[PDB]
Amino acid sequence: VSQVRQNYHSDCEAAVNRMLNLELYASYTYSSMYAFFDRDDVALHNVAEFFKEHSHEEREHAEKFMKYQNKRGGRVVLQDIKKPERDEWGNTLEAMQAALQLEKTVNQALLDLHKLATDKVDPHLCDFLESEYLEEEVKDIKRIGDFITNLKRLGLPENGMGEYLFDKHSVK
Amino acid sequence: VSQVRQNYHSDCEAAVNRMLNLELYASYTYSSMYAFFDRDDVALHNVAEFFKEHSHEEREHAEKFMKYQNKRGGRVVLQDIKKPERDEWGNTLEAMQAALQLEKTVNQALLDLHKLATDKVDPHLCDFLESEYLEEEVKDIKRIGDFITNLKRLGLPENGMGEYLFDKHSVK
Amino acid sequence: VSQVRQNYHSDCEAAVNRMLNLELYASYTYSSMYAFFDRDDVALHNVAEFFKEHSHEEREHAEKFMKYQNKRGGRVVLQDIKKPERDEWGNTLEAMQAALQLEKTVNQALLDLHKLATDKVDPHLCDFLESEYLEEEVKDIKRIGDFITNLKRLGLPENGMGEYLFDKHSVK
Amino acid sequence: VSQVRQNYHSDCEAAVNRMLNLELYASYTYSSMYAFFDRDDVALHNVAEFFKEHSHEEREHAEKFMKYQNKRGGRVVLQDIKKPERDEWGNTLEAMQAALQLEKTVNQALLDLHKLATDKVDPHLCDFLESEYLEEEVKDIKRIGDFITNLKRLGLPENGMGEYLFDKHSVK
Ligand SMILES: [Cl-]
Ligand SMILES: [Cl-]
Ligand SMILES: [Cl-]
Ligand SMILES: [Cl-]
Ligand SMILES: [Cl-]
Ligand SMILES: [Cl-]
Ligand SMILES: [Cl-]
Ligand SMILES: [Cl-]
Ligand SMILES: [Cl-]
Ligand SMILES: [Cl-]
Ligand SMILES: [Cl-]
Ligand SMILES: [Cl-]
Ligand SMILES: [Cl-]
Ligand SMILES: [Cl-]
Ligand SMILES: [Co+2]
Ligand SMILES: [Co+2]
Ligand SMILES: [Co+2]
Ligand SMILES: [Co+2]
Ligand SMILES: [Co+2]
Ligand SMILES: [Co+2]
Ligand SMILES: [Co+2]
Ligand SMILES: [Co+2]
Ligand SMILES: [Co+2]
Ligand SMILES: [Co+2]
Ligand SMILES: [Co+2]
Ligand SMILES: [Co+2]
Ligand SMILES: [Co+2]
Ligand SMILES: [Co+2]
Ligand SMILES: [Co+2]
Ligand SMILES: [Co+2]
Ligand SMILES: [Co+2]
Ligand SMILES: [Co+2]
Ligand SMILES: [Co+2]
Ligand SMILES: [Co+2]
Ligand SMILES: [Co+2]
Ligand SMILES: [Co+2]
Ligand SMILES: [Co+2]
Ligand SMILES: [Co+2]
Ligand SMILES: [Co+2]
Ligand SMILES: [Co+2]
Ligand SMILES: [Co+2]
Ligand SMILES: [Co+2]
Ligand SMILES: [Co+2]
Ligand SMILES: [Co+2]
Ligand SMILES: [Mg+2]
Ligand SMILES: [Mg+2]
Ligand SMILES: [Mg+2]
Ligand SMILES: [Mg+2]
Ligand SMILES: [Mg+2]
Ligand SMILES: [Mg+2]
Ligand SMILES: [Mg+2]
Ligand SMILES: [Mg+2]
Ligand SMILES: [Mg+2]
Ligand SMILES: [Mg+2]
Ligand SMILES: [Mg+2]
Ligand SMILES: [Mg+2]
Ligand SMILES: [Mg+2]
Ligand SMILES: [Mg+2]
Ligand SMILES: [Mg+2]
Ligand SMILES: [Mg+2]
Ligand SMILES: [Mg+2]
Ligand SMILES: [Mg+2]
Ligand SMILES: [Mg+2]
Ligand SMILES: [Mg+2]
């Protein structure tokens, strides 16, 4: 084993690799949403840019796991980044709903990794998750839920005027 | 077809999607190189950061194709991003050799897309490739080739001192 | 022939004159749109100013062809600038639709001139078109298409509220 | 008991005193390394200064435990600070190896104190360790491991040139 490795369970190392992959997967999904809202027949640029920014953030989430792995003396092992579930995302409401579910998936994985770290008595990994991931997730989930509520209030999916208004006044 | 689409062949649209995927693939390979050189048993941080920067640049290459696709009225279609060919990259020389070959692969794909664009009489796509991709590729290939020459001169792979010296004085 | 003229085909020279005229024609059409949206019974000033700006840009497009002609040793030959197709432009959606079609007409002419330049083996004229015209056209067409999509989403032509909202939040 | 003391187990109080002593011990070891590399027959001043800085940091680690003890209403109890294990440290590689082991010892003690705090249901002490100690330890261990790898690559212990080069280009 690595000269630096101390108190780092094989199962945690593997789970960190799987989490890295899921962050990459989330990033790629958000990229797809960006491209959809930039289509000439969709054309919601502030929405598009929201998703582009999220994609970038998710990729940074992934990079932080790679650095973490090396710091602990684990070994980064990459897998394919699966394409997103959909090719097209309907409208702002459908997309935000999909983002909520994605975030909930990511959050569940983070919470599961925290339970594993707890079980293996790895306080450093617990602290990393709590200090760099769990609160950011809660905030993001809240933001997306708030957006969904407002999209529904605006009459989505049917009310195009409402969709326009959201792009112009929310997504800031 | 899209209201914006004009002089944009289906075959070019598809080839742009495939190129997008290859840029993503290149990005991911460079990320793997970064992680390898950041290992505690490798520990060539300037080398690592070179590859991290390249990864970031390649992802920007990919994003520019997505924007291009939408601007022309094509439709972005994503595929899985295949994991890199290797899990570990040997040493600085082996990695740089692999990067040269990757770049040559990417460049060939760009040149093939330019030939297709030429065949389909798409000057806008030709100009995009020439103005945003082909020269950047030539420069990168030259830089990597120069590095290889210097790594060989330094005695790689056997000469660890030489490898150290490269990390400390080249990769700027 | 001119002392400066080199590799400049008579057919390209003539086509440059015709293109100059079409740019002037486009400019004049946009001026008409400006005046329509400034009417007291139309009164969409941000829309009006969008079209005024476009008119100005198109006139600059024309001037650049005159300079080009002289630089190559061709001779500028002017024709009448035909009045626009319509005297009145309906509403924002109808106008944007007409602008899309105008731009597509202009773009087609530019692409046809590029094919002619290619046929006559005139790389300088190809480069001029690619570097000064073709990308600006793609961007403009995309912008107008995006606007159309949003006008439709807003309920045009029937939804006056939607038209108002567009003038106040798009056309920036 | 102290008027301030709440949820602070006698066993944790004692363990904090023992940890304080170990931080002092680590500091003193690093001072010894500093003095060794400053010898006229060793003369690796950047190496020396690395160890001097570490000594200073370790003493600050100790002071933070004294403050912690008082904040919780425990009582600081000091013991002798044992002299370092060695009087002379061989060379840069041997010293870095000894530092790695020292850090691993300190880290193990911190992790053991965290387990005790967990067992006694003391979240404040857990948080203190996680927020002020555990990550700093991981970073330091990684840094030292990286140095070891590079010293080995440089040919230590035999390659004096390599040792010189390390002092002049690493230890920044
Ligand atoms: Cl371990
Ligand atoms: Cl294990
Ligand atoms: Cl967080
Ligand atoms: Cl409003
Ligand atoms: Cl087409
Ligand atoms: Cl086609
Ligand atoms: Cl380029
Ligand atoms: Cl040197
Ligand atoms: Cl001529
Ligand atoms: Cl001629
Ligand atoms: Cl242009
Ligand atoms: Cl108590
Ligand atoms: Cl007690
Ligand atoms: Cl810390
Ligand atoms: Co469509
Ligand atoms: Co933007
Ligand atoms: Co994430
Ligand atoms: Co990054
Ligand atoms: Co997220
Ligand atoms: Co966030
Ligand atoms: Co408003
Ligand atoms: Co190893
Ligand atoms: Co760095
Ligand atoms: Co690239
Ligand atoms: Co980007
Ligand atoms: Co590249
Ligand atoms: Co480059
Ligand atoms: Co030097
Ligand atoms: Co009237
Ligand atoms: Co005005
Ligand atoms: Co024009
Ligand atoms: Co002018
Ligand atoms: Co125009
Ligand atoms: Co060309
Ligand atoms: Co060019
Ligand atoms: Co324009
Ligand atoms: Co002596
Ligand atoms: Co000094
Ligand atoms: Co310490
Ligand atoms: Co102090
Ligand atoms: Co320490
Ligand atoms: Co905890
Ligand atoms: Co905490
Ligand atoms: Co430190
Ligand atoms: Mg080893
Ligand atoms: Mg394992
Ligand atoms: Mg699949
Ligand atoms: Mg926090
Ligand atoms: Mg909020
Ligand atoms: Mg349509
Ligand atoms: Mg097709
Ligand atoms: Mg495979
Ligand atoms: Mg260039
Ligand atoms: Mg150079
Ligand atoms: Mg003459
Ligand atoms: Mg003639
Ligand atoms: Mg007439
Ligand atoms: Mg250009
Ligand atoms: Mg836009
Ligand atoms: Mg008292
Ligand atoms: Mg006691
Ligand atoms: Mg003794
Ligand atoms: Mg912290
Ligand atoms: Mg470092």
Give the closest-approach CA distance of B166 to chain D in angstroms.
Answer: 11
Name all chains with 3 or more CB-CB pairs below 8 Å to chain A. B, C, D
Q: Among residues B98, B82, B81, B79, which one has the least CA distance to residue B36?
A: B98
CB nearest to B43's CB, from D146, D165, D169: D146
Task: Look up residue D158 and give its DSSP letter.
Answer: T
Spatial separation of the C-alpha atoms in residues A1 and A20, rounded to whole Å: 21
Tokens 């105008």 identify what position?
Answer: C102
Q: Give the ligand at the shortest distance from the Cα of D81.
A: 62
Spatial separation of the C-alpha atoms in residues A20 and A102, rounded to whole Å: 15
Q: Which two tokens stand for residue A58?
A: 């998710």
Q: Which two tokens stand for residue A44?
A: 């919601």
Question: What are residue B51's phi and psi, to 5 degrees?
Answer: -70, -40
**Domain total of chain C:** 1
Burial B147-171 (b: 16+ CB within 10 A, else e): bbebbeebebeebbbbbbbbbbebb
Q: Which long-range contacts (CB under 8 A, 24 or more apart) does B130-136 make?
A: B132/B64, B133/B61, B134/B107, B134/B110
Asked whether the beta carbons of residue A164 and residue C145 sit closer than 8 angstroms, the reply is no
**Which residues partner with A81 through β-bridges?**
B81
CA A46–ligand 16 middle distance (angstroms) = 7
How many contacts does B have with C, using Cβ atoms within 8 A? 42
Does the CB of D107 have a partner CB in chain A at under 8 Å?
Answer: yes
Entry resolution (Å): 1.4
Are A145 and A152 within 8 A, CB to CB? no
Spatial separation of the C-alpha atoms in residues B30 and B28, rounded to whole Å: 5
CB nearest to D155's CB, from B40, B43, B160: B160
Classified as helix, coil or strand, A132 is helix
Question: What are residue A81's phi and psi, to 5 degrees?
Answer: -95, 110
Are A61 and A16 within 8 A, CB to CB? no
Spatial separation of the C-alpha atoms in residues B84 and B69, rounded to whole Å: 26
Give the closest-approach CA distance of D3 to chain A in angstroms.
Answer: 30
Rounded to 10 deg, the angle between the A135-153 and A92-119 helix axes is 160
CB atoms within 10 A of CB C160: 12
Q: What is the largest CA-CA distance in chain A?
A: 61
CB nearest to D115's CB, from A2, A121, A126: A121
Residues in B closer than 8 angstroms to A87, CB to CB, are: 77-78
- Chain A residue with CA closest to C141: the answer is A40
Let me know if C50 is exposed, middle or buried by CB neighbors in 10 A (0-12, 13-18, 19+): buried
CA D154–ligand 22 middle distance (angstroms) = 17
Q: How far is CA D67 from CA A23, B96, D70, D71, D74, in A?
A: 40, 51, 5, 6, 10
Quick one: three-class SS letters along chain C?
CCCCCCCCCHHHHHHHHHHHHHHHHHHHHHHHHHHHHCCCCCCCHHHHHHHHHHHHHHHHHHHHHHHHHHHHCCCCCCCCCCCCCCCCCCCHHHHHHHHHHHHHHHHHHHHHHHHHHHHCCCHHHHHHHHHHHHHHHHHHHHHHHHHHHHHHHCCCCCCHHHHHHHHHHCCC
Give the closest-approach CA distance of A127 to chain D in angstroms.
Answer: 6
Question: What are residue D134's phi and psi, to 5 degrees?
Answer: -65, -40
Give the closest-approach CA distance of D78 to chain B in angstroms.
Answer: 37
How many contacts does A have with D, using Cβ atoms within 8 A? 42
Does the CB of C70 have a partner CB in chain B at under 8 Å?
Answer: no
CB atoms within 10 A of CB D1: 9
Are B137 and B107 within 8 A, CB to CB? yes
CB nearest to A43's CB, from C150, C159, C169: C150
Spatial separation of the C-alpha atoms in residues A44 and A49, rounded to whole Å: 9
Tokens 């390390």 identify what position?
Answer: D166
- Who's near A83: CB < 8 A, 6+ residues apart? A28, A32, B78, B79, B80, B81
Q: Which two tokens stand for residue A1?
A: 């084993």
Q: Which long-range contacts (CB under 8 A, 24 or more apart) does D42-48 make?
A: D44/D92, D44/D163, D44/D167, D45/D167, D46/D167, D46/D168, D46/D171, D47/D92, D47/D95, D47/D166, D47/D167, D47/D171
Spatial separation of the C-alpha atoms in residues B7 and C22, rounded to whole Å: 19
CATH of the domain at B113: 1.20.1260.10
Does the CB of A164 have a partner CB in chain C at under 8 Å?
Answer: yes
- HSE-up of residue A37 (Cα within 13 Å, Cβ side): 23
Give the closest-approach CA distance of D145 to chain B in angstroms.
Answer: 6
Residues in B closer than 8 angstroms to D155, CB to CB, are: 160-161
Quick one: three-class SS letters along C90-101?
CCHHHHHHHHHH
Tokens 């992680």 identify what position?
Answer: B35
Give the closest-approach CA distance of D86 to chain A in angstroms.
Answer: 22
Q: Among residues C149, C62, C165, which one has the least CA distance to residue C97?
A: C149
Could you tell me the end-to-end alpha-carbon distance of chain A, in angstroms, rounded to an integer? 48
Could you tell me the end-to-end alpha-carbon distance of chain C, in angstroms, rounded to an integer? 48
CB atoms within 10 A of CB A109: 19
Are A22 and A109 within 8 A, CB to CB? yes
What residue type is D14 in one-letter code? A
Spatial separation of the C-alpha atoms in residues B149 and B140, rounded to whole Å: 14
**Which residues partner with B81 through β-bridges?**
A81
Asked whether the beta carbons of residue D145 and residue A4 sit closer than 8 angstroms, the reply is yes
Q: Among residues C172, C153, C171, C151, which one has the least CA distance to residue C163?
A: C151
Domain that holds residue A51: 1-172
Does the CB of A91 have a partner CB in chain B at under 8 Å?
Answer: no
Are D134 and D114 within 8 A, CB to CB? yes
Residues in B closer than 8 angstroms to C139, CB to CB, are: 71
Is chain C in touch with chain D: ≥3 Cβ pairs within 8 A? no
Q: Among residues B169, B46, B43, B23, which one has the least CA distance to residue B109?
A: B23
CA D140–ligand 54 middle distance (angstroms) = 35
Does the CB of D97 have a partner CB in chain A at under 8 Å?
Answer: no
Query: What value does the CA radius of gyration of chain B take, rounded to a whole number of Å?
Result: 18
Does the CB of A28 have a partner CB in chain B at under 8 Å?
Answer: yes
| DSSP string covering B137-160 | HHHHHHHHHHHHHHHHHTTTTT-H
CA D166–ligand 28 middle distance (angstroms) = 10
CB nearest to A35's CB, from B41, B70, B79: B70
Let me know if A10 is exposed, middle or buried by CB neighbors in 10 A (0-12, 13-18, 19+): exposed
Does the CB of A67 have a partner CB in chain D at under 8 Å?
Answer: no
CB nearest to A40's CB, from C146, C154, C155: C146
Give the closest-approach CA distance of B46 to chain C in angstroms.
Answer: 38
